[PDB]
């Protein structure tokens, strides 16, 4: 069981390296967040249907984090360049440590295409976002391209985003902004990236069992 | 899944010729589509693939310019298509899947697991 | 082009005895995410080619145990520990680190 005491479920989640890990835990059965968090988002931003994903979360009764698609596998787009100093580790910038900020690699971007077939036996919970970069500069400078998109698709979900380009208040400095999403994929369902940029890719995701059935 | 290839044909020199593979199934996901020709008695040659879902398509410079390869993404269904044949395009071509994707604990797949039955040309007077 | 070079061109076998085909590669396959990425595949008398390993040693479903794919880099090896009748046909490598390049075909013979 994990009650959450410096950390949103959302920053938990994610892996924000100003909440404490639990690194000697690696189940759980189910998670609560309280009312005033410390820590939420270190790289500003909103996750998206976030009452929906804290109901489902406080029903659960087993909860274990696997890696999914291994940072490196990453070979050419940049791995380790998408850090921050608003998510400091020890110090230093860093990020969210189960997503992977993707960078361009050599003056490049190519588009992504990505699938993970959910073979466990659990339900699986991925997480993903998309970076709004503060200007036109930055979004060249980060991907490359000036014009993108993410494309998420499973048997039931069929989003297409556009990044949006705006200069925002800072908020730990950042006057960019990230958007998170999630989905459930059942046993036996694939889920499928597509991005030439802007994209938070995936690297750890959560089996859970819900009580009963 | 399967990969489903048109019927044999015979064609004379100079004749087009548009050749189909079906991906069974919703297509989803979408893997890229190979074609594949193999000369009487001889080994494997890989001509080109292409993604149905976008028709974004790679060519292998070699068979580039005598063959051109398109899709369909509604029926996601792979085409193979000369405009003008030759003796040396008589051949079996194979189209085949290129299933490429993370599972499990983060292990990965990638090959071609799903092959057509391959389609037989003939070019004949 | 990777030039794909496998040894023997045709390999005889005494049935249930162990057998292993080689195959070589002009550039190095192994990929920085770790995995050589090298396949093999078998195409039965008038059958379309099938998987039998991918990324060099994976074996795929439904392929019997008794195949397996080993070696790194330049120097790949398909093993087949006891060699059955139902094994006959042509053993191709194939790379997909580039657009894919084959081997030139290993025809196995079974000396009943």
């Known amino acids: 069981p994990l009650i959450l005491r410096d950390c949103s479920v959302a920053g938990w989640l994610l892996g924000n390296p100003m909440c404490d890990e639990f690194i000697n835990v690696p189940e759980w059965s189910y998670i609560v967040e309280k009312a005033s968090p410390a820590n939420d988002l270190c790289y500003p931003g909103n996750f998206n249907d976030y009452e929906e994903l804290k109901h489902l979360l406080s029903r659960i009764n087993h909860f274990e984090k696997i890696q999914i698609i291994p940072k490196s596998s990453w070979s050419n787009h940049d791995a380790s360049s998408g850090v921050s100093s608003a998510c400091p580790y020890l110090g230093r910038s860093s990020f969210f440590r189960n997503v992977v900020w993707l960078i361009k690699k050599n003056s490049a971007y190519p588009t992504i295409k990505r699938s993970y077939n959910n073979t466990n036996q659990e339900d699986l919970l991925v997480l993903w976002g998309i970076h709004h970069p503060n200007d036109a500069a930055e979004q060249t400078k980060l991907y490359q391209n000036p014009t993108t998109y993410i494309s998420v698709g499973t048997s039931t979900l069929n989003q297409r985003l556009v990044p949006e380009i705006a200069t925002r208040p800072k908020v730990n400095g950042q006057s960019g902004r990230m958007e998170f999403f999630w989905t459930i994929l059942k046993p036996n369902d694939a889920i499928n990236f597509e991005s030439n940029g802007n994209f938070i890719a995936p690297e750890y995701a959560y089996k859970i069992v819900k009580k009963g059935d | 899944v399967q990969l489903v290839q048109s019927g044999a044909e015979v064609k004379e020199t100079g004749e087009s010729l548009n050749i189909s593979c079906k991906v069974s199934?919703?297509?989803?996901?979408?893997?890229?589509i190979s074609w594949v020709r193999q000369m009487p008695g001889n080994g494997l040659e890989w001509m080109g693939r292409?993604?149905?879902?976008?028709?974004?398509?790679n060519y292998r410079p070699s068979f580039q310019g005598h063959v051109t390869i398109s899709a369909d993404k509604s029926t996601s269904t792979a085409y193979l298509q000369w405009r003008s044949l030759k003796a040396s395009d008589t051949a079996m071509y194979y189209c085949?899947?290129?299933?490429?994707?993370?599972?499990?604990?983060?292990?990965?797949?990638?090959?071609?697991?799903?092959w057509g039955q391959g389609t037989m040309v003939t070019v004949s007077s | 082009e990777i030039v794909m070079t496998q040894s023997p061109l045709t390999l005889p076998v005494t049935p249930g005895a162990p057998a292993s085909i080689s195959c070589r590669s002009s550039?190095?396959?192994?990929?920085?995410?770790?995995?050589?990425?090298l396949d093999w595949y078998l195409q039965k008398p008038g059958q379309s080619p099938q998987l039998l390993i991918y990324?060099?040693?994976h074996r795929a479903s439904g392929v019997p145990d008794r195949f397996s794919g080993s070696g790194s880099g330049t120097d790949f090896t398909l093993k087949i520990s006891r060699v059955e009748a139902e094994d006959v046909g042509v053993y191709y490598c194939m790379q997909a680190l580039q657009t894919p390049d084959f081997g030139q075909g290993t025809r196995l013979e079974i000396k009943r």
């Open positions: 990324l060099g040693s």
């Open positions: 292409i993604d149905p879902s976008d028709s974004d398509t």
């Open positions: 199934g919703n297509n989803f996901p979408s893997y890229y």
């Open positions: 085949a899947r290129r299933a490429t994707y993370y599972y499990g604990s983060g292990s990965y797949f990638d090959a071609f697991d799903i």
């Open positions: 550039q190095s396959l192994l990929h920085s995410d770790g995995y050589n990425y």
